[PDB]
């Protein structure tokens, strides 16, 4: 069997460099040669205890592209069971008697990990657990870097925006730090700085990182410009307007960009990337979103199928 067969996919911390490479190789293969009947007769539960339309549409599309059937829910609070008294433990004990895999998103950290303890032999894939992990977003981000750059090592990666509360930037930084020779540029207001525990992790591995006040400081050298959302609702409206200017990207900022440079953003973007960027060859956020299908298909195939025919 492949190393990920019947494994839970909960955290980027649990995946090795070899694991990540396997998922990415498998995604390239399915992208080039789709296998629409691979998961025929499999039923997958799409369990969004916390609603997330874009992640859910992406994940369910990946299920259907492999031929699996899908049952599920999305829960504001409107859902029977549903926000109230039954434990998550019991909910998983029940659902894991129904389906062949559980994809779940939940507002509490650790929820997917707890699920693995009750799902018996049914694999759990974490589609987001509070401020903790979102491993498939990281995998689609990694796949996109690898596809556009040809590698995951010796890259110059800028991360811009809310580096403090972005679970996706923490996970991406952790994942890229499993590879060699990468260098990071962090561009964020002081209130939203990349957390010290990430910096200490980098320092321990001898990975170079530095802070910069503007994107133009490093545009000439960047391979990947990874832009994050900055949710106004955790800055003062005045504070946000005071600091947004240095974390907003326009086409004009890209004049000295390398030919290989790609601009990524996990979306939704609102203010951070002007629409004039969209038409530049550097814009790659919709392609990135598209790649979520292939990364998520690869994960489902590896987990639910012993030996990938290809």
């Amino acid at each position: 069997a492949n190393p990920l067969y019947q494994k839970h996919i909960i955290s980027i911390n649990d995946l090795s460099r070899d694991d990540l490479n396997l998922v990415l190789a498998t995604a390239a293969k399915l992208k080039a040669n789709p296998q629409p009947e691979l998961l025929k007769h499999k039923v997958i539960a799409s369990c969004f205890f916390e609603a997330s339309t874009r992640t859910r549409l992406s994940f369910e599309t990946s299920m259907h592209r492999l031929g699996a059937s899908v049952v599920g829910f999305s829960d504001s609070a409107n859902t029977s069971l549903g926000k109230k008294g039954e434990t998550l433990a019991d909910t998983i004990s029940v659902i894991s008697t129904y389906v062949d895999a559980i994809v779940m998103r939940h507002p509490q950290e650790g929820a997917a990990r707890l699920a693995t303890e009750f799902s018996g032999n049914v694999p759990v894939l974490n589609a987001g657990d509070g401020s903790n992990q979102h491993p498939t977003q990281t995998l689609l981000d990694l796949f996109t870097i690898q596809e556009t750059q040809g590698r995951l090592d010796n890259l110059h990666v800028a991360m811009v925006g809310d580096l403090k509360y972005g679970r996706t930037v923490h996970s991406l930084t952790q994942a890229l730090a499993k590879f060699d020779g990468n260098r990071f540029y962090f561009i964020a207001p002081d209130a939203l700085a990349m957390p010290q525990y990430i910096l200490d992790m980098l320092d321990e591995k001898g990975i170079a990182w530095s802070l910069h006040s503007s994107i133009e400081e490093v545009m000439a050298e960047v391979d990947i410009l990874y832009m994050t959302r900055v949710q106004k609702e955790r800055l003062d409206p005045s504070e946000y307007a005071n600091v947004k200017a240095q974390f907003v990207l326009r086409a004009s900022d890209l004049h000295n960009a390398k030919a290989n440079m790609k601009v990524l953003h996990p979306l939704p973007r609102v203010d951070e990337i002007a629409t004039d960027v969209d038409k530049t060859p550097h814009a790659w956020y919709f392609q990135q979103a598209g790649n979520g299908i292939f990364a998520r298909q690869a994960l489902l195939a590896l987990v639910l199928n012993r030996d990938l025919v290809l």
Partner: protein, 148 residues
């Protein structure tokens, strides 16, 4: 000499910090047995001035059971006793994981009010010990986890 007499056989946990013996009895469910137990709290000590002491007859602790004491009684001495003689002395050393007894200080952690046991990865720093929750994957000072 002795307020709490010698035992023929079992375990004696000596050199427990004042105000920690009761904590140990509670956290580790030490009194949930029919075996005879004798305890001294606020006893004098040469090496520590004031100590707690727990004797549990016909009962022995594994090495990690002793290690699970490390966080609360790092200079405790666990004495194995048979036929009235200390046949073994051991000292708690920081374990790799601490289960059941700690509570995750993340209020949004799934661990709260779900039928699971708490679990923390242990790693010594320099002026504290960091505890990383199995569930939420957040890491905390032992000083934060241990308090309210």
């Amino acid at each position: 000499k002795l307020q709490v007499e010698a035992i023929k056989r079992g375990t004696v946990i000596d050199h427990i910090p004042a105000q920690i013996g009761f904590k140990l009895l509670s956290l580790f469910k030490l009194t949930e047995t029919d075996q005879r137990i004798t305890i001294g709290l606020n006893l004098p000590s040469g090496e520590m001035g004031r100590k707690d002491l727990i004797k549990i007859e016909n009962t022995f602790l594994s090495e990690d059971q002793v290690d699970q004491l490390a966080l609360y009684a790092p200079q405790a001495t666990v004495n194995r006793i048979d036929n009235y003689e200390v046949v073994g002395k051991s000292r708690p050393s920081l374990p790799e994981r601490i289960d059941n007894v700690l509570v995750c200080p993340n209020s949004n952690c799934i661990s709260h009010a779900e039928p699971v046991s708490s679990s923390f990865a242990v790693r010594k720093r320099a002026n504290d010990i960091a505890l990383k929750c199995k569930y939420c994957e957040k890491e905390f000072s032992h000083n934060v986890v241990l308090a309210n």
